Design a protein around this ligand. Structure first.
Ligand SMILES: Nc1ncnc2c1ncn2[C@@H]1O[C@H](COP(=O)(O)OP(=O)(O)OP(=O)(O)O)[C@@H](O)[C@H]1O
Ligand SMILES: Nc1ncnc2c1ncn2[C@@H]1O[C@H](COP(=O)(O)OP(=O)(O)OP(=O)(O)O)[C@@H](O)[C@H]1O
Ligand SMILES: Nc1ncnc2c1ncn2[C@@H]1O[C@H](COP(=O)(O)OP(=O)(O)OP(=O)(O)O)[C@@H](O)[C@H]1O
Lengths: 48, 266, 237, 384, 210, 249, 244
């Protein structure tokens, strides 16, 4: 978000995932399988 | 709308403008000769060469003559805040010109937006090179240009696309040159015939005095000589004031670096 | 080390020769004017700073032989390497060829010295410009030369180098004559003092004058002397 | 009596004028009573209320147009009633009828917060000879800026095109800033002034729309003189490097070449550029005929600085004590902004005292503070 | 210069298969969720009108090698690259939907287009050959009128390493020369002088010791 | 200044040009050269140089760009003249070396070839010869001469390391204007005082003052009189007799 | 390779000027002050230490003051490592002069030699300067007492009163007002002390933070007694002048 507006669109949607994954919202019997083609693109809060 | 500049007024009196008159001007007047030949008529042309050679001045001259639509583009006008916006712009502009019948698209100053394609792997040049690509894909198309005559004006051939400078879609490409020792004499006669001067002068003399130079200097040899005219409080221009002015322009050129310099990188 | 400190420029120069000329511009101003039977080098000294020992400190005019003076503008520190080469060549000429040096031969040597540090690798030019003046031996023609950090040498009728040299050079077109020098030694000294008082200003204590007459007589006029010469110019003006 | 004489005529005339217009408000409507009075009734009923703002995208030549309203819905409106179609053409803000939308007329137009930076609200109160001295390199800025507006006659005798452009260049503080604002007081035609630091932005694409605009407004409200103050600022100022950088600098330059000149055939936009990084510009910028006579300024000479210092000490309290000429002696090829700062600093010594007088002592002290600035970011002392 | 785009149009029309015309820069949009939606609707359409060949002209506009982006609007561009790689996976109803792709360079493609399953067969268009050049010249020159003293081998020896766009540009350039002499038939001595006048390069530059 | 140069980090590095950039720059320092004109005939060679006045306080009769290599070979320097201070010594050494080893007047071509072998020795250490330079020389010569084996010859020596034998060549700033006139007015049927007067014709056009012997100098190399520098009194006569015949028009 | 990573720090700036010299001059006002004041009967050299700690031993320290020979001592201000080197170069030069002429060096000659050494490092070889400033107090018969400062460029000027190191501008102003052409050594000692009391970069000014040394004509028979004082003789003359 020194780029375009696209990159804070990314940011809004990413913050939503973290409260889900670990929060006062707790999981469950729900599982994440995450398939990526290169993992060092990622934000390290998605390496967590 | 077509600005009024005579065809005899030109930025350079050469055979180079005659070559233009065979690619652009003549199949609009007569596609009869190019039917008799049967050849496909050439459409594109590159206009290139040093500044002050009246790059855009002969294309205002040719806009007086042909009376076709002129649709002028600035290459720095093709870049917007967000990417793919400018993708919209170019595509749409070309399709409006297809609907239009007997039109010319004059690509001015497409040194940014028209440049070479290359990879940076982290740049911000990629976002610009989307619109660079949008210019290619429209020119070949999947349909031909149905009477769209295409000029590209580049200061620089030093960097250009090699598929915006492939030789089948920019056809004959004309190097515009510096006036000769005869060519400055021609230019400067178009320019001093327009000025009141005291008869018995040499237009040959003033060219010799000058080194190999532009006519945009010869348009300013007159006008600065005209200011030395008003300070002496003369209605007329004489030899003496023309000498001061030749010295004035040349000294300045060296001091900076007006010629044999083109700057940029893309 | 054998890597270049001189990188050729597309302009038709070398950057470091252009940088070396500026460095000379920022230096203290020297005038040279030659009479019919003298030379006169006047130089500005900044004595503006107070509690300066001036007795023990060398003038900005250095004798390099018994009849060849060298004055300089630009980097003061750098200059001393040139003065040590030049004193060394002066003896070498006596050793191997006999007689004292000629002003021309010595000027050429200096020219090749500053030149060398342009063209060689591992070294940057010297930003120091010299006024070399003097007599040839057996002779009584004043010969006044200027060498410059481009390693280009020149003869001159009169010259000035240093800070705001242009202001003095225009004065020298108009008050010194190509055809006639002023013929007394005294008038020549006062013509050069009168010139110095354009840029130097601020009293007569920042003016220093070395006068050389043939037959190997280098004497430098003290402050007191200058004081009298300046006051004359002052009153007449 | 010398102020009063001016006042006595001019005030009484502004008081009468004001009074005149009060009695006169009523009187406007009296030469008609059905000749125009009636016309007014007819237009109004057509218009009704509210007149809904639209934005006109494009016209069609069959008496219709396509508006896009800022409230969303497009409408295929008709150009009918009390409207010329020559006062219509892209970019207009229009009055629509609140039942069936017809364009009843165009009255609305809305100014940008960027045409607000460009357009000036002043006419310069200072005029020429507030840095005066070097007053022969000023008739290269009044024989090519002032004068072809003032006289067409002179350049008609010689015929041909009359002057176009100047680039002012030199040391900083040598008057460049005040030169531009001193010719704008004399000519009295639309004076635009834009800083070059605002031409450099941290966002792309908007860079070119700004530079393309300045000359478009300029040609519209012609004659205009556009002062581009600082075009040395295009290569030294730059924010980030990923929406800044080379790309953004190159594009704004490219844009500026079309404007001046280019193919536009815009209005009169004499140009005044101040610079000192003239070799960070294009060869198609410092091209002749977009620069005509170019002006070099160097530092004033000793007798010039006496012109400069007597302008500045007229506004100040004086004594027989004050001596200008020894202040001149000390400074040696320095800017007249240096000399302008000693006089401004000399009243700072008066202010510090709280004494209303200015003395020779006040000018010499602030000369020492001015020379402290110059040689103390230096630390060589004597040239090493 | 090798007539990448020309070949694909001609051959897909000859043999008949539903020819979808898509230029890759059109997928770039400053909208997402509408620009990205041309991709979505481009499979949905294509599975109805199946078997069909999806011709993307250029594939550098959405075929960015980048997927490590730092501080740019290149994460907007790549969402039409990613959405492409999803529907070029089977969740069936794509076994009969194909891809032709033309591109000017192939060193700019993503590592997820090196792989088979995307474009499996990888065809290079080479610079012309001796036999090939001679042919090319005859196909343009069929359109215009020539004289009967032409030898297509002569012209093809004398052009070496000329691409098909330059060779189109000799054939045209010959009837310019014809027009200027003022004929109505195009000689075999004109095509030779169009070699010099229009190429690709203006001479061998200035040589001062080369 | 600041004109695109992709490569130029090495002092020999390539370059999509196919030739080094640094050598090219060296030739662009000879267009700032004070103009040197030279007309070679079969009866003699005339080297004319504009001494170049810079000031009225500069003594312009003391400074000159005629430089003697030896009695049978003369040479003229234009460009950056500090670079020619080093080479001209070398060339004079060279000639002398030949007279020591062989007791013979050296070929003009051979001598020209020797300062070219010198001209190419820029580098950080490479080839057979140890580099001692690091930046290329920015100076061009016109070595004239007379040998009794191939006659009058005149060579244009480059900072490149290349030599082209000319029949007349002008170099310097006004080079472009000079070579238009040489092309039409030169021929091989000239005589010595018609050439001499041709040097002053072309000198007249590239003159930035006016023509007089206080800023122009002529010099010759003649078979039976050798290399002779023409003094100013003699120079004057010819300049006036041009001015007599140009007033017969 | 190597040429790529080459610093090139010995090239001129656009100003004609040498960035690394200035950077050296910048960093010596980060080292302590050393002052010289020339009396007519002797020379006082007064240095303020750039270190002090109660756990420091600053009593065998002669960390600013060095004897080059028994007639010319120096005050050092700057990077001490570079300085140590020149100090034994100087000793080697003094003894050389003494070997060949069998006569002690004049102050004029040794100051010119050190200066030429410095000049070489800024002139070429791609090195960085030796960032040191020396105040030379010396006696010779030919020109008497002579006082000198040299800087990292390698240029020298004689002075009647000088200050180097920290607050150069400041110390200079003071010196000019409280100097008189001819003084006794005591009056000088006093003045030396007084300037350092107004310029001290900590409020307090003490004996253990003074290195202090003279050269006195209080040696009979026209000889000069070089004295580097013990810090307990400094303590008394500091109570004398009433600072402490
Ligand atoms: N060769 C010439 N003969 C006559 N007039 C000339 C010539 N060259 C330049 N001019 C003058 O220069 C003026 C402006 O040139 P113009 O803008 O048309 O040129 P260009 O070569 O496209 O350069 P640029 O596009 O970089 O401005 C012309 O109106 C004309 O007065
Ligand atoms: N000749 C002078 N007479 C009066 N004031 C002067 C003169 N020269 C300059 N000044 C004053 O100095 C100040 C700065 O000058 P100005 O902006 O006009 O020019 P400049 O050379 O562009 O310098 P800078 O841009 O750094 O301020 C202004 O208040 C100006 O009036
Ligand atoms: N085999 C051929 N036969 C005849 N003419 C040919 C042939 N191939 C190409 N050409 C000519 O060359 C032109 C260029 O071809 P095309 O545009 O298809 O190529 P490309 O390599 O994809 O180039 P670009 O996409 O950069 O325009 C054709 O329109 C035609 O005139």
């Amino acid at each position: 978000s020194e780029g375009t507006s696209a990159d804070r669109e990314i940011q809004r949607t990413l913050m939503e995932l973290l409260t889900q994954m670990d929060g006062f919202d707790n999981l469950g019997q729900t599982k994440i399988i995450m398939a990526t083609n290169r993992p060092d693109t990622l934000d390290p809060a998605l390496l967590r | 709308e077509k600005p009024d500049v005579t065809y005899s007024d030109v930025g350079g009196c050469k055979d180079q403008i005659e070559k233009l008159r065979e690619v652009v001007e003549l199949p609009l007047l007569s596609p009869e000769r190019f039917a008799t030949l049967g050849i496909d008529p050439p459409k594109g042309i590159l206009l290139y060469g040093p500044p002050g050679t009246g790059k855009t001045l002969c294309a205002r001259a040719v806009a007086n003559r042909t009376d076709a639509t002129f649709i002028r583009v600035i290459g720095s006008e093709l870049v917007q805040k967000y990417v793919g916006e400018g993708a919209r712009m170019v595509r749409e502009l070309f399709e409006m010109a297809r609907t239009k019948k007997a039109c010319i698209i004059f690509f001015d100053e497409i040194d940014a937006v028209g440049g070479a394609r290359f990879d940076d792997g982290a740049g911000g040049d990629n976002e610009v090179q989307r619109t660079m690509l949008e210019l290619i894909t429209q020119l070949d198309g999947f349909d031909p240009r149905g009477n769209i005559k295409v000029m590209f004006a580049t200061n620089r051939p030093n960097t250009l696309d090699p598929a915006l400078l492939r030789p089948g879609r920019i056809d004959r490409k004309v190097e515009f040159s510096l006036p000769d020792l005869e060519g400055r004499a021609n230019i400067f006669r178009i320019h001093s015939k327009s000025m009141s001067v005291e008869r018995g002068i040499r237009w040959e003399l003033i060219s010799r005095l000058c080194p190999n130079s532009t006519g945009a200097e010869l348009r300013s040899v007159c006008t600065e000589a005209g200011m030395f005219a008003i300070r002496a409080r003369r209605k007329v221009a004489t030899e003496k004031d023309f000498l001061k002015a030749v010295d004035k322009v040349i000294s300045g050129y060296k001091k900076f670096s007006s010629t044999s310099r083109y700057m940029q990188y893309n | 080390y054998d890597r270049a400190l001189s990188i050729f420029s597309p302009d038709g120069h070398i950057f470091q020769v252009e940088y070396a000329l500026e460095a000379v511009k920022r230096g203290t101003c020297a005038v040279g004017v030659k009479g019919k039977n003298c030379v006169v080098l006047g130089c500005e000294r900044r004595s503006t700073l107070k509690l300066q020992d001036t007795r023990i400190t060398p003038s900005k005019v250095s004798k390099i032989d018994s009849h060849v003076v060298l004055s300089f503008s630009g980097l003061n520190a750098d200059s001393r390497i040139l003065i040590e080469k030049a004193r060394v060549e002066a003896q070498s000429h006596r050793l191997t060829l006999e007689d004292p040096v000629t002003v021309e031969y010595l000027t050429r040597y200096v020219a090749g010295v500053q030149q060398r540090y342009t063209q060689s690798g591992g070294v940057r030019p010297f930003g120091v410009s010299t006024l070399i003046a003097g007599f040839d031996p057996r002779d009584d023609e004043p010969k006044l030369y200027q060498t410059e950090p481009s390693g280009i040498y020149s003869s001159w009728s009169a010259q000035t180098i240093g800070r705001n040299s242009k202001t003095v050079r225009e004065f020298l077109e108009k008050n010194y004559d190509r055809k006639e020098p002023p013929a007394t030694v005294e008038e020549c000294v006062k013509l050069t003092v009168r010139s110095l008082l354009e840029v130097v200003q601020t009293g007569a204590k920042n003016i220093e004058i070395t006068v050389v007459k043939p037959d190997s007589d280098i004497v430098a006029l003290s402050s007191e002397e200058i004081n009298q010469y300046v006051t004359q110019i002052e009153q007449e003006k | 009596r010398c102020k009063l004489k001016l006042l006595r005529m001019e005030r009484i005339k502004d008081h009468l004028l004001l009074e005149e217009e009060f009695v006169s408000n009523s009187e406007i409507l009296k030469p008609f009573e059905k000749k125009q009075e009636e016309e007014k009734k007819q237009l109004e009923e057509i218009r009704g209320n509210p007149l809904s703002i639209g934005t006109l995208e494009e016209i069609i030549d069959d008496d219709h147009a396509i508006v896009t309203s800022p409230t969303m819905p497009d409408y295929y409106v008709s150009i009918l009633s009390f409207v010329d179609k020559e006062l219509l053409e892209p970019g207009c803000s229009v009055l629509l009828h609140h039942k069936t939308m017809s364009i009843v007329g165009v009255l609305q137009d809305d100014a940008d917060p960027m045409v607000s930076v460009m357009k000036m609200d002043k006419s310069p109160t200072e005029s020429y000879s507030d840095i005066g001295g070097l007053e022969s390199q000023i008739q290269e800025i009044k024989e090519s800026v002032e004068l072809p507006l003032t006289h067409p006659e002179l350049y008609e005798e010689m015929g041909i095109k009359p002057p176009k452009g100047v680039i002012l260049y030199g040391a900083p503080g040598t008057g460049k800033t005040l030169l531009a604002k001193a010719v704008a007081n004399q000519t009295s035609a639309t004076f635009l002034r834009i800083v070059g630091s605002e031409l450099i932005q941290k966002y792309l694409g908007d860079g070119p729309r700004l530079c393309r605009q300045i000359f478009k407004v300029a040609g519209e409200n012609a004659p205009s003189i556009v002062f581009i103050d600082e075009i040395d600022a295009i290569g030294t100022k730059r924010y980030d490097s990923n929406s800044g950088g080379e790309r953004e600098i190159q594009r704004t330059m490219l844009e500026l070449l079309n404007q001046l000149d280019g193919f536009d055939d815009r209005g009169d936009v004499k140009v005044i550029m101040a610079t000192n990084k003239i070799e960070t510009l294009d060869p198609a910028l410092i091209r002749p005929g977009r620069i005509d006579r170019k002006i070099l300024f160097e530092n004033p000479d000793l007798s010039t600085k006496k012109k400069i210092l007597g302008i500045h000490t007229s506004k100040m309290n004086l004594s027989e004590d004050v001596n200008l000429e020894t202040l001149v002696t000390t400074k040696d090829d320095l800017s007249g902004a240096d000399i302008q700062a000693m006089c401004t600093e000399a009243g700072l010594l008066a202010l510090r005292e709280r004494r209303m007088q200015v003395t020779a002592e006040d000018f010499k002290q602030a000369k020492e503070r001015v020379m402290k600035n110059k040689v103390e970011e230096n630390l060589e002392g004597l040239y090493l | 210069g090798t007539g990448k785009t020309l070949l694909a149009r001609a051959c897909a029309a000859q043999t008949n298969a539903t020819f979808l015309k898509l230029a890759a820069p059109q997928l770039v949009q400053m909208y997402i969720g509408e620009g990205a939606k041309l991709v979505r609707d481009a499979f949905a359409l294509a599975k109805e009108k199946a078997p069909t060949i999806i011709f993307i002209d250029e594939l550098d506009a959405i075929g960015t090698k980048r997927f490590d982006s730092e501080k740019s609007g290149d994460r907007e561009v790549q969402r039409t690259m990613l959405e492409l790689l999803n529907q070029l996976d089977g969740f069936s109803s794509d076994d009969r939907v194909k891809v032709l792709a033309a591109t000017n360079r192939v060193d700019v493609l993503d590592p997820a287009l090196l792989r088979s399953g995307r474009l499996d067969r990888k065809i290079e268009f080479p610079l012309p050959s001796e036999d090939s050049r001679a042919q090319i010249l005859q196909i343009h020159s069929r359109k215009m009128t020539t004289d009967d003293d032409i030898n297509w081998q002569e012209l093809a020896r004398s052009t070496d390493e000329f691409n098909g766009a330059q060779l189109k540009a000799v054939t045209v350039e010959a009837g310019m020369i014809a027009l200027r002499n003022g004929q109505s038939s195009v000689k075999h001595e004109d095509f030779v002088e169009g070699i010099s006048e229009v190429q690709a390069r203006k001479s061998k530059s200035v040589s001062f010791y080369a | 200044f600041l004109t695109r140069s992709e490569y130029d980090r090495g002092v020999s590095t390539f370059s999509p040009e196919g030739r080094l950039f640094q050598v090219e720059y060296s030739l662009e320092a000879i267009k700032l050269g004070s103009t040197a004109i030279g007309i070679a005939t079969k009866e003699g060679v005339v080297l004319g140089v504009e001494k170049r006045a810079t000031s009225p306080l500069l003594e312009s009769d003391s400074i000159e760009k005629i430089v003697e290599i030896d009695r049978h070979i003369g040479c003229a320097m234009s460009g950056l003249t500090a670079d020619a201070r080093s080479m001209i010594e070398h060339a004079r050494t060279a000639a002398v070396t030949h007279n020591l080893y062989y007791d013979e007047d050296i070929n003009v071509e051979s001598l020209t070839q020797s300062v070219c072998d010198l001209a190419l020795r820029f580098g950080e250490g490479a080839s057979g010869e140890e580099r001692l330079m690091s930046r290329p020389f920015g100076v061009a010569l016109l070595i004239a001469g007379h040998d009794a084996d191939d006659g009058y010859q005149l060579f244009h020596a480059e900072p490149s390391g290349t030599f082209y034998r000319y029949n007349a060549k002008a170099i310097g700033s006004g080079s472009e204007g000079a070579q238009a006139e040489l092309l039409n007015e030169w021929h091989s049927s000239l005589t010595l005082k018609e050439a001499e007067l041709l040097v002053l014709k072309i000198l007249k056009q590239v003159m930035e003052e006016k023509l007089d012997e206080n800023n122009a100098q002529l010099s010759c190399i003649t078979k039976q009189d050798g290399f002779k520098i023409y003094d100013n009194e003699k120079t004057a006569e010819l300049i006036k007799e041009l001015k007599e015949k140009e007033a017969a028009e | 390779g190597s040429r790529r990573y080459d610093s090139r720090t010995t090239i001129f700036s656009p100003e004609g000027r040498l960035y690394q010299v200035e950077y050296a001059l910048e960093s010596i006002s980060h080292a302590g002050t050393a002052i010289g004041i020339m009396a007519s009967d002797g020379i006082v050299l007064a240095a303020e230490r750039k270190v002090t700690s109660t756990l420091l031993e600053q009593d065998t320290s002669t960390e600013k003051l060095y004897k080059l020979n028994d007639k010319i001592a120096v005050a050092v201000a700057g990077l001490t490592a570079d300085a140590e080197i020149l100090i034994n170069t100087a000793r080697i030069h003094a003894q050389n002069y003494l070997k060949t002429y069998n006569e002690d060096i004049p102050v004029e000659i040794l100051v010119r030699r050190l200066s030429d050494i410095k000049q070489g490092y800024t002139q070429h070889g791609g090195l960085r300067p030796f960032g040191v400033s020396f105040i030379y107090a010396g006696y010779d018969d030919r020109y008497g007492y002579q006082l000198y400062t040299s800087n990292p460029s390698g240029n020298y000027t004689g002075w009647k009163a000088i200050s180097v190191g920290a607050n150069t501008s400041a110390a200079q102003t003071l010196l000019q007002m409280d100097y008189k052409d001819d003084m006794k050594v005591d009056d000088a000692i006093e003045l030396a002390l007084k300037t350092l009391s107004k310029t001290t970069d900590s409020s307090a000014l003490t004996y253990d933070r003074l290195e202090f040394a003279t050269i006195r004509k209080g040696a009979n028979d026209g000889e000069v007694y070089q004295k580097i004082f013990k810090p307990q003789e400094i303590k008394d003359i500091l109570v004398k002048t009433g600072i402490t």
